[PDB]
Each structure stands twice: as structure tokens, then as C-alpha cells.
Amino acid sequence: DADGRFLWADSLAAGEPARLMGYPVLIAEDMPDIAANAYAIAFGDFGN
Amino acid sequence: ATGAAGDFAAVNASDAVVDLVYALGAEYRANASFVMNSKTAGAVRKMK
């Protein structure tokens, strides 16, 4: 945030909240990383 | 790598510690741990 503290996983202890804005996180190691025009995060219902 | 060649990153430290955590791979984070000496944990604890 602007104060310089973490938004996700508030402190430097106890990381990985297992909720990104209330929705689960799948760490799929085959998506692109942060490039110029990358799509590094994909949100959606992949069940459908 | 951290950034500046002398110590942690000047602008935003603790960014070099968190990408270290996420550089290791998912299957090894089940039981992994940091390894530092006393005075390095001091430099980590001084991060504000």
C-alpha cells in the first residue's frame, strides 16, 4: 500500500493466505511471467 | 539477486526476500527454511 506494508499476507511472517480476494489460487508453473505484454494472471471459472 | 551491490535493495527491501521464497519451487516449500547468521537476521529485522 502507500504506507509500504503488504496488502496480501499482511506481515513478513505467515505468508500465502490461500485466498486472492476471496477466491482460491492455483500456482500453475506454465503460465508466462511478468513480461511487457504478458498475461501472467488468469481469473475465471475453468470448471465451465 | 537483490539489487544494490552492498546490501538489500535501497528503495524496497524485503522484495528480495519474498522472491527468494517463490524461486524455490512448489514441492520443496512443504518443509523449507531460511538459513542466515545472527547479524543478517538483524538486517532483515531492521526492514521497515
Side-chain angles (χ1 to χ4, degrees):
Chain A
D1 50 14
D3 262 336
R5 59 184 294 166
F6 299 121
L7 290 154
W8 203 32
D10 52 358
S11 42
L12 268 175
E16 264 298 310
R19 300 275 104 175
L20 188 42
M21 202 158 294
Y23 304 103
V25 166
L26 178 86
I27 303 289
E29 300 275 3
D30 316 80
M31 286 198 67
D33 39 7
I34 324 295
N37 286 353
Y39 307 87
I41 305 190
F43 179 78
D45 183 9
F46 299 91
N48 301 322
Chain B
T2 65
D7 205 85
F8 283 103
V11 56
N12 198 22
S14 70
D15 270 349
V17 172
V18 59
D19 48 9
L20 174 49
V21 179
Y22 285 99
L24 170 61
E27 308 303 317
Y28 298 111
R29 289 181 225 155
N31 49 356
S33 68
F34 294 79
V35 190
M36 295 167 287
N37 50 359
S38 160
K39 71 168 302 299
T40 301
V44 164
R45 211 166 169 191
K46 289 155 69 177
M47 293 191 297
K48 63 183 55 59

mmCIF file of all heavy atoms in Angstrom, chain B:
data_model
loop_
_atom_site.group_PDB
_atom_site.id
_atom_site.type_symbol
_atom_site.label_atom_id
_atom_site.label_comp_id
_atom_site.label_asym_id
_atom_site.label_seq_id
_atom_site.Cartn_x
_atom_site.Cartn_y
_atom_site.Cartn_z
ATOM 1 N N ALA B 1 19.119 -12.302 -7.163
ATOM 2 C CA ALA B 1 19.849 -11.105 -6.792
ATOM 3 C C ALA B 1 18.929 -10.149 -6.052
ATOM 4 O O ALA B 1 17.705 -10.212 -6.170
ATOM 5 C CB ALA B 1 20.440 -10.425 -8.022
ATOM 6 N N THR B 2 19.532 -9.265 -5.263
ATOM 7 C CA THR B 2 18.740 -8.306 -4.511
ATOM 8 C C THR B 2 18.520 -7.018 -5.291
ATOM 9 O O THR B 2 17.387 -6.544 -5.408
ATOM 10 C CB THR B 2 19.416 -7.971 -3.186
ATOM 11 O OG1 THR B 2 20.654 -7.308 -3.446
ATOM 12 C CG2 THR B 2 19.676 -9.217 -2.394
ATOM 13 N N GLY B 3 19.585 -6.448 -5.829
ATOM 14 C CA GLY B 3 19.541 -5.072 -6.273
ATOM 15 C C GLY B 3 20.891 -4.433 -6.051
ATOM 16 O O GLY B 3 21.886 -4.884 -6.620
ATOM 17 N N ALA B 4 20.931 -3.360 -5.265
ATOM 18 C CA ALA B 4 22.194 -2.724 -4.924
ATOM 19 C C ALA B 4 23.218 -3.765 -4.494
ATOM 20 O O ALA B 4 22.881 -4.788 -3.892
ATOM 21 C CB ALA B 4 21.991 -1.698 -3.811
ATOM 22 N N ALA B 5 24.481 -3.499 -4.821
ATOM 23 C CA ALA B 5 25.546 -4.479 -4.662
ATOM 24 C C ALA B 5 26.071 -4.582 -3.238
ATOM 25 O O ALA B 5 26.905 -5.450 -2.970
ATOM 26 C CB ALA B 5 26.698 -4.151 -5.610
ATOM 27 N N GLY B 6 25.630 -3.725 -2.330
ATOM 28 C CA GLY B 6 26.182 -3.739 -0.991
ATOM 29 C C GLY B 6 25.320 -4.401 0.062
ATOM 30 O O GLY B 6 25.829 -5.095 0.945
ATOM 31 N N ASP B 7 24.012 -4.200 -0.027
ATOM 32 C CA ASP B 7 23.084 -4.646 1.000
ATOM 33 C C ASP B 7 21.767 -4.970 0.313
ATOM 34 O O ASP B 7 21.729 -5.198 -0.900
ATOM 35 C CB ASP B 7 22.956 -3.569 2.095
ATOM 36 C CG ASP B 7 22.526 -4.134 3.446
ATOM 37 O OD1 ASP B 7 23.399 -4.586 4.214
ATOM 38 O OD2 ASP B 7 21.317 -4.093 3.749
ATOM 39 N N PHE B 8 20.684 -4.997 1.081
ATOM 40 C CA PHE B 8 19.374 -5.193 0.493
ATOM 41 C C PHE B 8 19.052 -4.050 -0.464
ATOM 42 O O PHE B 8 19.776 -3.061 -0.563
ATOM 43 C CB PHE B 8 18.304 -5.282 1.577
ATOM 44 C CG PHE B 8 18.274 -6.592 2.284
ATOM 45 C CD1 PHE B 8 18.813 -6.726 3.539
ATOM 46 C CD2 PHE B 8 17.696 -7.692 1.692
ATOM 47 C CE1 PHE B 8 18.783 -7.929 4.186
ATOM 48 C CE2 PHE B 8 17.664 -8.897 2.333
ATOM 49 C CZ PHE B 8 18.206 -9.016 3.582
ATOM 50 N N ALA B 9 17.944 -4.198 -1.177
ATOM 51 C CA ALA B 9 17.540 -3.169 -2.120
ATOM 52 C C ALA B 9 17.293 -1.865 -1.380
ATOM 53 O O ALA B 9 16.774 -1.854 -0.260
ATOM 54 C CB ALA B 9 16.291 -3.601 -2.881
ATOM 55 N N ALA B 10 17.700 -0.758 -1.994
ATOM 56 C CA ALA B 10 17.590 0.528 -1.319
ATOM 57 C C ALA B 10 16.144 1.002 -1.259
ATOM 58 O O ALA B 10 15.656 1.394 -0.193
ATOM 59 C CB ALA B 10 18.467 1.562 -2.024
ATOM 60 N N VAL B 11 15.436 0.961 -2.387
ATOM 61 C CA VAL B 11 14.094 1.532 -2.423
ATOM 62 C C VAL B 11 13.112 0.661 -1.652
ATOM 63 O O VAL B 11 12.431 1.133 -0.736
ATOM 64 C CB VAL B 11 13.638 1.768 -3.874
ATOM 65 C CG1 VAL B 11 13.703 0.491 -4.704
ATOM 66 C CG2 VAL B 11 12.227 2.322 -3.886
ATOM 67 N N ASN B 12 13.022 -0.618 -2.005
ATOM 68 C CA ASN B 12 12.048 -1.519 -1.399
ATOM 69 C C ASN B 12 12.752 -2.825 -1.058
ATOM 70 O O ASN B 12 12.796 -3.746 -1.873
ATOM 71 C CB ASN B 12 10.878 -1.734 -2.329
ATOM 72 C CG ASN B 12 9.675 -2.272 -1.616
ATOM 73 O OD1 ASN B 12 9.545 -2.117 -0.405
ATOM 74 N ND2 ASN B 12 8.778 -2.899 -2.362
ATOM 75 N N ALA B 13 13.290 -2.904 0.153
ATOM 76 C CA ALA B 13 13.820 -4.157 0.653
ATOM 77 C C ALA B 13 12.670 -5.114 0.924
ATOM 78 O O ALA B 13 11.498 -4.795 0.718
ATOM 79 C CB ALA B 13 14.648 -3.922 1.908
ATOM 80 N N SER B 14 13.011 -6.320 1.366
ATOM 81 C CA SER B 14 12.038 -7.376 1.626
ATOM 82 C C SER B 14 11.318 -7.778 0.350
ATOM 83 O O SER B 14 10.432 -8.633 0.377
ATOM 84 C CB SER B 14 11.014 -6.954 2.681
ATOM 85 O OG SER B 14 10.143 -5.960 2.177
ATOM 86 N N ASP B 15 11.675 -7.155 -0.767
ATOM 87 C CA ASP B 15 11.258 -7.675 -2.054
ATOM 88 C C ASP B 15 12.226 -8.744 -2.511
ATOM 89 O O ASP B 15 11.843 -9.656 -3.248
ATOM 90 C CB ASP B 15 11.188 -6.553 -3.086
ATOM 91 C CG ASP B 15 9.827 -5.903 -3.144
ATOM 92 O OD1 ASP B 15 8.886 -6.446 -2.536
ATOM 93 O OD2 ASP B 15 9.695 -4.849 -3.800
ATOM 94 N N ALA B 16 13.479 -8.646 -2.066
ATOM 95 C CA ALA B 16 14.490 -9.650 -2.345
ATOM 96 C C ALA B 16 14.338 -10.885 -1.480
ATOM 97 O O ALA B 16 14.918 -11.922 -1.802
ATOM 98 C CB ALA B 16 15.881 -9.060 -2.141
ATOM 99 N N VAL B 17 13.585 -10.799 -0.389
ATOM 100 C CA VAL B 17 13.355 -11.969 0.443
ATOM 101 C C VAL B 17 12.147 -12.753 -0.047
ATOM 102 O O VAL B 17 12.132 -13.983 0.035
ATOM 103 C CB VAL B 17 13.189 -11.560 1.915
ATOM 104 C CG1 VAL B 17 12.754 -12.733 2.746
ATOM 105 C CG2 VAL B 17 14.484 -11.012 2.451
ATOM 106 N N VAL B 18 11.140 -12.070 -0.582
ATOM 107 C CA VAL B 18 9.907 -12.749 -0.953
ATOM 108 C C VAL B 18 10.043 -13.438 -2.300
ATOM 109 O O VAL B 18 9.478 -14.516 -2.504
ATOM 110 C CB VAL B 18 8.737 -11.758 -0.928
ATOM 111 C CG1 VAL B 18 9.008 -10.643 -1.865
ATOM 112 C CG2 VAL B 18 7.465 -12.455 -1.321
ATOM 113 N N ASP B 19 10.791 -12.859 -3.240
ATOM 114 C CA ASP B 19 11.011 -13.576 -4.490
ATOM 115 C C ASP B 19 11.985 -14.726 -4.300
ATOM 116 O O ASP B 19 12.008 -15.647 -5.119
ATOM 117 C CB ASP B 19 11.513 -12.641 -5.583
ATOM 118 C CG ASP B 19 12.632 -11.768 -5.118
ATOM 119 O OD1 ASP B 19 13.127 -12.008 -4.003
ATOM 120 O OD2 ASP B 19 13.021 -10.845 -5.862
ATOM 121 N N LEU B 20 12.794 -14.683 -3.244
ATOM 122 C CA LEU B 20 13.570 -15.852 -2.858
ATOM 123 C C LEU B 20 12.649 -16.996 -2.463
ATOM 124 O O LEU B 20 12.896 -18.154 -2.811
ATOM 125 C CB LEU B 20 14.502 -15.497 -1.705
ATOM 126 C CG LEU B 20 15.297 -16.627 -1.068
ATOM 127 C CD1 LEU B 20 15.979 -17.452 -2.112
ATOM 128 C CD2 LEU B 20 16.304 -16.055 -0.115
ATOM 129 N N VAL B 21 11.583 -16.687 -1.730
ATOM 130 C CA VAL B 21 10.654 -17.717 -1.283
ATOM 131 C C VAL B 21 9.962 -18.356 -2.471
ATOM 132 O O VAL B 21 9.674 -19.558 -2.470
ATOM 133 C CB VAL B 21 9.636 -17.119 -0.303
ATOM 134 C CG1 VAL B 21 8.673 -18.174 0.140
ATOM 135 C CG2 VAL B 21 10.350 -16.533 0.879
ATOM 136 N N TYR B 22 9.683 -17.568 -3.500
ATOM 137 C CA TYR B 22 8.927 -18.028 -4.652
ATOM 138 C C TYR B 22 9.822 -18.443 -5.802
ATOM 139 O O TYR B 22 9.323 -18.737 -6.891
ATOM 140 C CB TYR B 22 7.948 -16.947 -5.089
ATOM 141 C CG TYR B 22 6.773 -16.872 -4.162
ATOM 142 C CD1 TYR B 22 6.708 -15.920 -3.172
ATOM 143 C CD2 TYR B 22 5.745 -17.788 -4.255
ATOM 144 C CE1 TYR B 22 5.645 -15.871 -2.323
ATOM 145 C CE2 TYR B 22 4.683 -17.743 -3.412
ATOM 146 C CZ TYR B 22 4.635 -16.783 -2.447
ATOM 147 O OH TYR B 22 3.562 -16.735 -1.597
ATOM 148 N N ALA B 23 11.128 -18.469 -5.584
ATOM 149 C CA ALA B 23 12.060 -19.003 -6.558
ATOM 150 C C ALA B 23 12.359 -20.474 -6.341
ATOM 151 O O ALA B 23 13.023 -21.077 -7.186
ATOM 152 C CB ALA B 23 13.368 -18.219 -6.529
ATOM 153 N N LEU B 24 11.887 -21.069 -5.245
ATOM 154 C CA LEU B 24 12.337 -22.406 -4.876
ATOM 155 C C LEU B 24 11.506 -23.515 -5.505
ATOM 156 O O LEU B 24 12.032 -24.602 -5.762
ATOM 157 C CB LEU B 24 12.311 -22.570 -3.354
ATOM 158 C CG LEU B 24 12.517 -23.992 -2.832
ATOM 159 C CD1 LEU B 24 13.871 -24.505 -3.255
ATOM 160 C CD2 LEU B 24 12.363 -24.105 -1.344
ATOM 161 N N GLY B 25 10.259 -23.268 -5.817
ATOM 162 C CA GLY B 25 9.502 -24.373 -6.357
ATOM 163 C C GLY B 25 8.477 -24.864 -5.357
ATOM 164 O O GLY B 25 8.670 -24.792 -4.139
ATOM 165 N N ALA B 26 7.372 -25.384 -5.877
ATOM 166 C CA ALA B 26 6.221 -25.641 -5.024
ATOM 167 C C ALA B 26 6.411 -26.871 -4.149
ATOM 168 O O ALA B 26 5.984 -26.879 -2.992
ATOM 169 C CB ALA B 26 4.967 -25.786 -5.878
ATOM 170 N N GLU B 27 7.034 -27.921 -4.677
ATOM 171 C CA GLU B 27 7.123 -29.161 -3.919
ATOM 172 C C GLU B 27 8.122 -29.079 -2.782
ATOM 173 O O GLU B 27 8.036 -29.874 -1.843
ATOM 174 C CB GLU B 27 7.487 -30.314 -4.846
ATOM 175 C CG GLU B 27 6.595 -30.410 -6.060
ATOM 176 C CD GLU B 27 5.128 -30.534 -5.698
ATOM 177 O OE1 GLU B 27 4.807 -31.297 -4.763
ATOM 178 O OE2 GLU B 27 4.293 -29.877 -6.357
ATOM 179 N N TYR B 28 9.069 -28.151 -2.841
ATOM 180 C CA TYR B 28 10.055 -28.021 -1.783
ATOM 181 C C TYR B 28 9.647 -27.042 -0.697
ATOM 182 O O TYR B 28 10.299 -26.998 0.348
ATOM 183 C CB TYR B 28 11.387 -27.576 -2.369
ATOM 184 C CG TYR B 28 11.971 -28.557 -3.341
ATOM 185 C CD1 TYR B 28 12.039 -28.264 -4.689
ATOM 186 C CD2 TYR B 28 12.458 -29.775 -2.910
ATOM 187 C CE1 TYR B 28 12.574 -29.155 -5.578
ATOM 188 C CE2 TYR B 28 12.995 -30.673 -3.792
ATOM 189 C CZ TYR B 28 13.052 -30.358 -5.124
ATOM 190 O OH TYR B 28 13.591 -31.256 -6.007
ATOM 191 N N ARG B 29 8.588 -26.268 -0.901
ATOM 192 C CA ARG B 29 8.147 -25.352 0.136
ATOM 193 C C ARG B 29 7.323 -26.030 1.217
ATOM 194 O O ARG B 29 6.933 -25.364 2.176
ATOM 195 C CB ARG B 29 7.337 -24.217 -0.473
ATOM 196 C CG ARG B 29 8.146 -23.239 -1.269
ATOM 197 C CD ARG B 29 7.242 -22.167 -1.802
ATOM 198 N NE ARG B 29 7.524 -21.887 -3.196
ATOM 199 C CZ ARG B 29 6.636 -21.377 -4.038
ATOM 200 N NH1 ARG B 29 5.412 -21.106 -3.619
ATOM 201 N NH2 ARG B 29 6.967 -21.151 -5.297
ATOM 202 N N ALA B 30 7.042 -27.323 1.091
ATOM 203 C CA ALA B 30 6.291 -28.003 2.136
ATOM 204 C C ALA B 30 7.032 -27.927 3.462
ATOM 205 O O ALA B 30 6.453 -27.557 4.490
ATOM 206 C CB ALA B 30 6.028 -29.455 1.740
ATOM 207 N N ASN B 31 8.320 -28.262 3.459
ATOM 208 C CA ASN B 31 9.169 -28.086 4.637
ATOM 209 C C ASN B 31 10.501 -27.514 4.161
ATOM 210 O O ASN B 31 11.455 -28.249 3.906
ATOM 211 C CB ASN B 31 9.350 -29.382 5.412
ATOM 212 C CG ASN B 31 9.738 -30.533 4.532
ATOM 213 O OD1 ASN B 31 9.801 -30.398 3.312
ATOM 214 N ND2 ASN B 31 10.032 -31.672 5.143
ATOM 215 N N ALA B 32 10.557 -26.196 4.047
ATOM 216 C CA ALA B 32 11.770 -25.474 3.722
ATOM 217 C C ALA B 32 12.021 -24.449 4.814
ATOM 218 O O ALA B 32 11.151 -24.176 5.640
ATOM 219 C CB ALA B 32 11.660 -24.800 2.355
ATOM 220 N N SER B 33 13.223 -23.885 4.831
ATOM 221 C CA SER B 33 13.551 -22.913 5.863
ATOM 222 C C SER B 33 14.691 -22.037 5.389
ATOM 223 O O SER B 33 15.498 -22.442 4.554
ATOM 224 C CB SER B 33 13.940 -23.589 7.176
ATOM 225 O OG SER B 33 15.171 -24.267 7.042
ATOM 226 N N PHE B 34 14.749 -20.832 5.939
ATOM 227 C CA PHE B 34 15.844 -19.928 5.656
ATOM 228 C C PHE B 34 17.073 -20.345 6.448
ATOM 229 O O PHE B 34 16.990 -21.100 7.417
ATOM 230 C CB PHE B 34 15.469 -18.498 6.017
ATOM 231 C CG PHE B 34 14.378 -17.926 5.179
ATOM 232 C CD1 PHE B 34 13.066 -18.243 5.421
ATOM 233 C CD2 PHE B 34 14.669 -17.060 4.150
ATOM 234 C CE1 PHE B 34 12.070 -17.714 4.658
ATOM 235 C CE2 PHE B 34 13.674 -16.529 3.385
ATOM 236 C CZ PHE B 34 12.374 -16.856 3.640
ATOM 237 N N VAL B 35 18.230 -19.867 6.005
ATOM 238 C CA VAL B 35 19.484 -20.075 6.720
ATOM 239 C C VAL B 35 20.234 -18.752 6.693
ATOM 240 O O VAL B 35 20.627 -18.286 5.622
ATOM 241 C CB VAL B 35 20.341 -21.194 6.116
ATOM 242 C CG1 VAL B 35 21.488 -21.509 7.031
ATOM 243 C CG2 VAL B 35 19.530 -22.441 5.911
ATOM 244 N N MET B 36 20.425 -18.147 7.858
ATOM 245 C CA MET B 36 21.138 -16.886 7.977
ATOM 246 C C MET B 36 22.062 -16.975 9.177
ATOM 247 O O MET B 36 22.060 -17.963 9.911
ATOM 248 C CB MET B 36 20.173 -15.713 8.152
ATOM 249 C CG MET B 36 19.285 -15.457 6.974
ATOM 250 S SD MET B 36 17.938 -14.340 7.362
ATOM 251 C CE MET B 36 16.910 -15.398 8.350
ATOM 252 N N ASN B 37 22.856 -15.938 9.382
ATOM 253 C CA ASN B 37 23.593 -15.795 10.621
ATOM 254 C C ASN B 37 22.927 -14.712 11.454
ATOM 255 O O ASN B 37 21.971 -14.071 11.023
ATOM 256 C CB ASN B 37 25.068 -15.498 10.355
ATOM 257 C CG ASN B 37 25.264 -14.383 9.377
ATOM 258 O OD1 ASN B 37 24.304 -13.827 8.870
ATOM 259 N ND2 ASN B 37 26.514 -14.037 9.113
ATOM 260 N N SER B 38 23.433 -14.516 12.670
ATOM 261 C CA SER B 38 22.749 -13.633 13.606
ATOM 262 C C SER B 38 22.649 -12.215 13.064
ATOM 263 O O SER B 38 21.598 -11.579 13.173
ATOM 264 C CB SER B 38 23.462 -13.637 14.956
ATOM 265 O OG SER B 38 23.129 -12.492 15.717
ATOM 266 N N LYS B 39 23.721 -11.704 12.464
ATOM 267 C CA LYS B 39 23.708 -10.313 12.045
ATOM 268 C C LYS B 39 22.936 -10.094 10.757
ATOM 269 O O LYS B 39 22.583 -8.953 10.458
ATOM 270 C CB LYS B 39 25.129 -9.781 11.885
ATOM 271 C CG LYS B 39 25.869 -10.330 10.695
ATOM 272 C CD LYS B 39 27.144 -9.550 10.444
ATOM 273 C CE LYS B 39 26.855 -8.083 10.209
ATOM 274 N NZ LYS B 39 25.992 -7.889 9.016
ATOM 275 N N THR B 40 22.670 -11.144 9.984
ATOM 276 C CA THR B 40 21.816 -10.970 8.818
ATOM 277 C C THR B 40 20.351 -10.917 9.219
ATOM 278 O O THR B 40 19.595 -10.089 8.705
ATOM 279 C CB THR B 40 22.042 -12.086 7.809
ATOM 280 O OG1 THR B 40 23.414 -12.087 7.410
ATOM 281 C CG2 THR B 40 21.179 -11.882 6.594
ATOM 282 N N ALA B 41 19.936 -11.777 10.147
ATOM 283 C CA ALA B 41 18.592 -11.662 10.692
ATOM 284 C C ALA B 41 18.379 -10.301 11.321
ATOM 285 O O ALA B 41 17.244 -9.828 11.409
ATOM 286 C CB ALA B 41 18.338 -12.760 11.714
ATOM 287 N N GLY B 42 19.454 -9.661 11.775
ATOM 288 C CA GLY B 42 19.347 -8.284 12.211
ATOM 289 C C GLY B 42 19.039 -7.343 11.066
ATOM 290 O O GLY B 42 18.200 -6.451 11.195
ATOM 291 N N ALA B 43 19.695 -7.535 9.925
ATOM 292 C CA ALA B 43 19.421 -6.672 8.783
ATOM 293 C C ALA B 43 18.041 -6.929 8.207
ATOM 294 O O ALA B 43 17.439 -6.025 7.623
ATOM 295 C CB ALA B 43 20.487 -6.864 7.709
ATOM 296 N N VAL B 44 17.536 -8.153 8.341
ATOM 297 C CA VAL B 44 16.163 -8.440 7.946
ATOM 298 C C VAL B 44 15.187 -7.786 8.905
ATOM 299 O O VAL B 44 14.184 -7.202 8.488
ATOM 300 C CB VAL B 44 15.934 -9.958 7.865
ATOM 301 C CG1 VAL B 44 14.468 -10.253 7.842
ATOM 302 C CG2 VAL B 44 16.586 -10.519 6.630
ATOM 303 N N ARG B 45 15.472 -7.853 10.202
ATOM 304 C CA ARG B 45 14.560 -7.291 11.184
ATOM 305 C C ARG B 45 14.524 -5.772 11.155
ATOM 306 O O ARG B 45 13.529 -5.185 11.585
ATOM 307 C CB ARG B 45 14.940 -7.764 12.579
ATOM 308 C CG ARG B 45 13.766 -7.887 13.501
ATOM 309 C CD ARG B 45 14.139 -8.665 14.726
ATOM 310 N NE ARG B 45 13.110 -8.586 15.750
ATOM 311 C CZ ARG B 45 13.284 -9.004 16.997
ATOM 312 N NH1 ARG B 45 14.446 -9.514 17.365
ATOM 313 N NH2 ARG B 45 12.303 -8.901 17.876
ATOM 314 N N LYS B 46 15.573 -5.124 10.669
ATOM 315 C CA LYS B 46 15.590 -3.674 10.545
ATOM 316 C C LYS B 46 14.793 -3.166 9.355
ATOM 317 O O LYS B 46 14.699 -1.950 9.178
ATOM 318 C CB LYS B 46 17.031 -3.180 10.442
ATOM 319 C CG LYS B 46 17.790 -3.296 11.730
ATOM 320 C CD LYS B 46 19.275 -3.406 11.512
ATOM 321 C CE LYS B 46 19.866 -2.121 11.003
ATOM 322 N NZ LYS B 46 21.340 -2.251 10.861
ATOM 323 N N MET B 47 14.248 -4.052 8.528
ATOM 324 C CA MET B 47 13.485 -3.623 7.362
ATOM 325 C C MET B 47 12.155 -3.039 7.801
ATOM 326 O O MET B 47 11.383 -3.698 8.502
ATOM 327 C CB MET B 47 13.271 -4.789 6.403
ATOM 328 C CG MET B 47 14.549 -5.277 5.748
ATOM 329 S SD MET B 47 14.280 -6.424 4.386
ATOM 330 C CE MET B 47 13.493 -7.778 5.236
ATOM 331 N N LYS B 48 11.878 -1.810 7.383
ATOM 332 C CA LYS B 48 10.721 -1.071 7.852
ATOM 333 C C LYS B 48 9.992 -0.452 6.675
ATOM 334 O O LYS B 48 10.536 -0.327 5.576
ATOM 335 C CB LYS B 48 11.126 0.020 8.836
ATOM 336 C CG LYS B 48 12.016 1.083 8.228
ATOM 337 C CD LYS B 48 12.439 2.092 9.272
ATOM 338 C CE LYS B 48 13.089 1.404 10.449
ATOM 339 N NZ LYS B 48 14.277 0.621 10.031
#
